Write a protein that binds this ligand. Structure first.
Ligand code: OXL
Ligand code: OXL
Ligand code: OXL
Ligand code: OXL
Ligand code: OXL
Lengths: 156, 156, 156, 156, 156, 156, 156, 156, 156, 156
């Protein structure tokens, strides 16, 4: 039977413990997700308290990180989601994604309504991935793809 | 000589007048940007107060929307950016992008540091675009690509 | 071409003009929605800035309220939604629905994941309605039905 | 003699312990409330710190969850209610109910005044229930019924 | 037909205009309410935007204050209630009532539950009045009587 | 020598411990205050961190609740007052007193200035009490009397 | 008959008009208060919306500032006090008085309880004054005297 | 070598321990400061986490309060100042000083600019003291003297 | 006689008008400050509402921008300072300076205490300037110099 | 493999323990950084939770401060950056840098756009330093140099 959380601090405390174990073992997120059959973004989000892992994946990452049975069980519980400490990120890496919404948020609304209609792009029927691409002028770029279903708003 | 704003309400009021003109003329953002040589996300953002148009594009979109000369000059001003009225969007279409940050923000931090290193993905050396793709399960998806330069944080 | 708003004050100012006209004509929301083919909750939400009317409904309600052509066009624009002035309602009638979330919000979460699974009850593939029922102990009750599709959160 | 709490964190910490015990037993909220005589929404809310259980119900749920005597006693205390961590939910599942208020809160006020009059729909002489139904179009829907007494506001 | 407001500013602006007229005429709240059949606290609250006057009262007070027909109609609309500008009062006179809740709010909760049970004292089936009483030690005291119905919270 | 606190959490943590002991002993606030010579509202507020008890009263309640010496001493310290967790109560029973201020705050100001003059009704030279009485229409009402000295604001 | 305000913006707009008149006349606050029989801090506070003037003072400062009859009347109304735009000052000169509270506020509490007892130093039976003195080290100092009555908190 | 703090909770937790020792020993702030050669207001602020003590004074107060060596070292660290829990005081004694700024803050600005010029009254080149004075109408008054250097704002 | 403001919107409205004039004339801040004998940072800050210009400088910039007499007068008034709309900038350009504080504020605290002692680096006895220079690795850098007097905190 | 944190409290608690150890050993930040090859601002920022130390530097400063192996590992993790407790500093020393932004933020934006163009001065490709300089008029000044790359915002 599915089990859910109502206080994010239980899973965020678990995330800190996971990160300490990961650093002592000198592991990467890519290696932790290898063998799970699931995307690194989804498995990493689960470790950090923002998704639930199916039981086989929870057991696999739990073995890798030497987690105890209550922690393996917690990873399978549906989380109380919300990773930002107090609404607006302070960390510069996270903040730039918030700034993209301060600059482009009304343009995303306007272009979603023009291309699709009234309604939303879902954050639930939704995938994201991060890719590293060479910049032709020198250095490296991240191409982050947000891929969400359009759900319409219609009269009733 | 470059000119800049410090009170966002000037450009946001102009945006509201632009949208009324646009609706009276039954125009699209794609047709407003057509002919400018600039991407619809950039031109749209400028109309909405969050970018500046070069003078030729300002005159081109000003002719389409029948803007007066003060308005065409305002579109060339560097804006005081920030499109969200009070930090967290209330509109559902805009909110889902904020929710993507609440769910995935720490994942994007973690994977950016793993793939690239300490530092950020820029929101300045940066472009985004919105594409509509058929969903194979039925319906339509938006694929929103966020494409930013990696800037490293190094000791000194 | 679909048209959209980015600043809620345009439509909320329109809503105040609509309400004054409505009061001077001594009209009900039920009579305004009559003839539109649309439910009272949907047409009232549009008048109040939170939904868009299709053109024929916009014209019908515009003639009933003696609205000008710019106002009739604005009712057809997709709104920048969000009716609460500053996040938490002060009005008692509105505040009770916010208190229902403070008391039952975690229970709604828990029972939605138990009955359906990880994911959400949508606020987009969604409708509500308000009915009056007699109370057997004396007086009247409101039965307010929230009806949303379940959308699952699945691994990828 | 009735007993009441003034700091929500006592009952919220108990809720987190309750959830871990429940998960270890693979228990449902429907099964926990079975045999209490009381509706699953009410019993679940008490577990989660937002209602008080009568003594018999507290002892019965305490047996199912292996709670100690201080925990059984705490479930009978009248709670300091308020389940949302910081006024606006971060969790997507809970957030959709807040969004319903941002889109329909003024329409609920207006139609409550039209159908009933000045005053409120109570959140205290009040019950709610969550029912899973089949979506005739495919999939599943939740029908959440908010059933509150109308209390008039009258001159005096 | 009942009519209701959604933006408090319209009635709060009218209250400022009423207070200017009141002061020019050197009128008391007591004499404005006298002859209406309605208690001073109710009529004063309506002038200040927090209650609706019946039509005959709105005409009476309207003639006393030389208000126009749009203002007399606005006094009859059900308000969007909430008199505090931004949640906590800045005015010392209003602030002391907020401090009474900061000092005694948990005691009022605890004593309400002990004397009555779980549930609330209503702010809707409710009246208050302000009386001046001599202090035996010299000076004057206010006795403000809050008189609300108890509404129980019971299991279902 | 009088002793005072600067961090409310010390006395709020003591209040939680007091309430657990009270519940285990199945005591009322009325009986705890019996024999102190002090009003139930004042003694209860002290238990809950918002007043100080005189030494003899602190020893009397301390014997009834089986408190240790540091707890008895802490009850005699002048508190850092303020019982509301975060400015606006979440709990419905407490919230209704806050709503009374949102509806009648400006009326209380206006009537206090008319009946007394410029200045305040004190929250320091002040007492309150709670009585339970029948409602003439059925059920029960609370009559809560706020009794504060008028302190004038005069020119200087 | 005493008259009072409920929205601070009426008197704060009058303050701005007063300050423009004062500047055109090259007047000082000390000259404006001259001849009124009232202290410059009290009169200046009334001009800035935070006190009420007696009628003879209001006419006198009105003569000096060329104010109209409605403005002289508004200065006699009891204000809705609160001069800080949004709770914490941004202006450096104002901000330093807030900082004094951040550094010494708990010391002020401690020493007031030690010297006087439980209770407050009043902000109502209260005067302040600002004096310029030489700094013996070079330069000038302000000596700002806060002079308030102690009102005890006693058991009841 | 000077040492400083960056998180206020270390010294605020020290303050709470100091206050419990002080109350167990039934000591006053006047007596703790005796023999230190420093003003009671300065030493008290140090104990409460808002100033640093020189080493001889830290050893002297440490012996009176039976503090351990780490605590005596912590009292010598330059603090992370800010005594107010969350920006606006809840405690009545502290809040009256904040209300003085809500009433007189713009008058302090105005008269400081008039008497001295553009710039500030420092909160660093600054002292304060609290004196008890009999009120001639009966009772006692506190005279709190704020004494800061004027620092001008000049063009450059 | 020096004249001061208490509502920032008067001078921020003037700033918008100055910026519109500046842009129509295609002027730079460097050219506006030329001849004034004052630094561009100081003159610019005055135009934007955050400093007062001496009368001769005001006259001369007023000439260039064609300002009316109430505007040349307003420029000489002491402002109510605070340029950020709502505490945290949304504009990227401004936000990076806030981020520098989020990353290095505690380091600045620590290194100021070690290099100078307890106290502050003044923001009043203070000058700032911005220089553009080449980056030795390609591109351009800003070298922004914050130059403030050290003011000590010492015992009294 | 790079490792990163998501809860700042782990590294902020480490900072408090570092500072205690530093004070017990009577060390300076200058001597902790001496010998690492890294600038004092960078090393100090790492100790305080806002930068990551390379492994050799983490071992070097770990020996100097007698840190354990877990602490030395934590210093190598990329931090969740943000040193300000709750957005606006309370500490006077930190607050003055926030005030510099309130006074000059719009002037920094305006002069950055004038000298460079649209875009930002980076807080990533960025260094700062603090120097002590004698003031010619007496005392000492800090010269704090902020040195950031310009990144342009260009059309696309
Ligand atoms: O994000 C969503 O998909 C919603 O409400 O339907
Ligand atoms: O919700 C309520 O029932 C109230 O105030 O009466
Ligand atoms: O509440 C009070 O009594 C005051 O400030 O004087
Ligand atoms: O308070 C102060 O002294 C400052 O910034 O100079
Ligand atoms: O977003 C950015 O590019 C920054 O600070 O460098």
């Amino acid at each position: 039977m599915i089990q859910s959380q109502i206080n994010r601090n239980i899973r965020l405390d678990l995330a800190d413990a996971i990160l300490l174990s990961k650093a002592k073992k000198d592991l990467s997120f890519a290696e932790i997700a290898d063998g799970t059959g699931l995307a690194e973004a989804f498995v990493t989000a689960a470790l950090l308290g923002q998704q639930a892992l199916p039981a086989d994946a929870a057991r696999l990452v739990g073995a890798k990180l030497d987690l105890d049975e209550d922690s393996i069980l917690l990873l399978q519980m549906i989380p109380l989601r919300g990773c930002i400490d107090d609404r607006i990120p302070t960390d510069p890496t996270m903040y730039r994604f918030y700034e993209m919404l301060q600059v482009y948020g009304t343009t995303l609304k306007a272009l979603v309504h023009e291309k699709f209609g009234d309604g939303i792009i879902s954050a639930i029927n939704f995938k994201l991935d991060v890719k590293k691409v060479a910049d032709p002028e020198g250095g490296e770029r991240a191409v982050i793809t947000l891929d969400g279903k359009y759900l319409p708003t219609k009269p009733f």
